[PDB]
Ligand binder design. Structure first.
Ligand code: FMN
Ligand code: FMN
Lengths: 208, 208
C-alpha cells in the first residue's frame, strides 16, 4: 500500500535544515488535515501556524529546551476549542447550511441539538472530547506531511498552559494540544537512519 | 494530493452491506494502522477484531441501537492498555531490543526509564494518554480503509463500560475507546450521496 510506504518514509525528525517551507506546501498539508473526520462532524480544533523566529525561541524555553520548535521552517500547533460552545457549533451550522441547502428552521433545530448536547458535557469533558478529535487530525497530518516529503515531529513535550499564555490563546477560546515543527530534515540528522520500532501485527491485532 | 482523494472517497458509513471483507484486506488495513506514530513509540493500544454476529447484535443493544455494529462484515475495536504498566513497557523494549540490537544493559536502562515515567502518571492520566494515542491510529485507519476502498464508520456512541464487560476486557488490561465496523457500503445508504461538510481552510488554519 502507498500509505505503508508513507509510514516508512516519515520519522520524528530530530534536526531540521534551514530550508524554507512554502505557503503552498503548508496549505496543502493543512487542507488535507482539514478534511479529517471528527465527532458529529464538529471539528472542535484548529491548526495555528507560526513562523516568527523570536516568538518560537520563546516557545523553546517552554518546550524543555527542544530547539527544533524554532529551528524548523514553520511551527504548526494543534489547538482545541475550549471556549464558548457557540464557537464550535455556529461555524459548523453555517457550513452544513450552505452545503446541504438547509432551511432556516432546519438549521436552527440542528444548532439547538448540538448546542444542547455539548452544554450537557462538563467543561472538562468537552475539552478532552475536543482534544481527542485533534489527535485524529494528527494522524492525517503525519501522513499528509509524508506524501509531500515534508518532515515533522509531533511534540507533547511542551508546557501547554505556557504556550497558551505566550500565544494569548485564551481570548480565542483555544487550548494547545500538541506542537509540530515542519520543514526538511538536516543531512546531519543521523536519527533518520534508526530502524523503526512498531508492535508486530501478531501483537497489535487481537482476534476475539 | 492522493490523500485528499482518499479523504473525499471515505465517509461515515450508515448502512453496510453483507459483503465479506477478507482477512488479507483487514490485515493490510491493520498493518498500515500499526505503523502509526505514538508518544515515546510506546503504542499503548491495540485493535480487537470481531466477526461473530450474535455477540455484535448484543453490542448493538449497548450502542443506542446502531445496527451498523452487527451488519458490517467485521468490527474493529480500538482498545487502550489500561492495566499493568509492564504490559505497555515490556512489549516495546522487546521490539526495540531486537530491531536496534541493544545490549542487555541498555534494554534494562530503557525499560526502567519508561516504567518510572508511566508510574509517575496517575491511572486516570495514563489511561487518557493511551486513549489519545489510539485516536492518532484512527486517523491512519480511516485513510488506510479509503485506500483499500473499504467502508467504515468510527463510533464513540457506545456504552464503553458495557463493551468492556461483555468482551471481558478488564482481564486483558484493555478499555474500549471506540468501535469501527468495516466492510462495504450498501447501495441503499443514501448518506453516501450527501455533500461532505468541513469547515473552510480560512477557519481551520489560523496564522499567527
Ligand atoms: C503524540 C506524540 C507526541 C510526541 N512528543 C514528542 C516530543 O515532545 N519530542 C520529541 O522529540 N518527539 C516526540 N514524539 C515523537 C515520538 O517519540 C515518535 O513518534 C515515536 O518514537 C515513533 O517513531 P517515528 O515517529 O520516528 O517513526 C511524539 C510523538 C507523538 C505521536
Ligand atoms: C471519533 C468519532 C466518533 C464517531 N461516532 C459516531 C457514532 O457513534 N455513530 C455514527 O453513526 N457516526 C459516528 N461518527 C461519524 C461522524 O459523524 C462523521 O465522521 C462526521 O459527521 C464527518 O463526516 P464523514 O465522516 O462522513 O466525512 C464518529 C466520527 C468520529 C471521528
Amino acid at each position: 500500500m502507498y500509505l505503508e510506504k508513507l509510514q516508512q518514509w516519515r520519522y520524528a525528525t530530530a534536526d531540521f535544515s534551514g530550508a524554507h517551507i512554502t505557503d503552498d506546501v503548508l496549505d496543502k498539508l493543512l487542507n488535507t488535515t482539514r478534511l479529517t473526520a471528527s465527532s458529529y462532524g464538529l471539528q472542535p480544533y484548529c491548526t495555528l501556524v507560526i513562523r516568527n523566529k523570536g516568538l518560537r525561541e520563546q516557545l523553546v524555553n517552554h518546550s524543555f529546551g527542544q530547539q527544533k520548535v524554532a529551528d524548523s521552517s514553520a511551527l504548526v500547533i494543534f489547538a482545541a476549542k475550549t471556549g464558548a460552545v457557540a464557537d464550535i457549533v455556529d461555524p459548523y451550522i453555517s457550513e452544513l447550511s450552505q452545503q446541504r441547502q438547509l432551511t432556516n428552521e432546519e438549521a436552527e433545530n440542528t444548532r439547538n441539538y448540538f448546542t444542547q448536547k455539548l452544554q450537557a458535557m462538563s467543561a472538562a469533558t468537552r475539552k478532552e472530547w475536543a482534544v481527542r478529535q485533534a489527535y485524529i487530525g494528527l494522524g492525517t497530518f503525519l501522513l499528509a506531511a509524508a506524501e509531500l516529503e515534508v518532515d515533522s515531529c509531533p511534540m507533547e513535550g511542551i508546557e501547554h498552559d505556557a504556550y497558551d499564555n505566550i500565544l494569548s490563546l485564551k481570548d480565542l477560546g483555544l487550548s494547545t494540544v500538541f506542537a509540530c515543527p515542519v520543514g526538511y530534515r538536516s543531512e546531519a540528522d543521523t536519527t533518520q537512519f534508526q530502524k523503526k520500532v512498531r508492535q508486530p501485527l501478531s501483537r497489535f491485532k487481537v482476534v476475539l
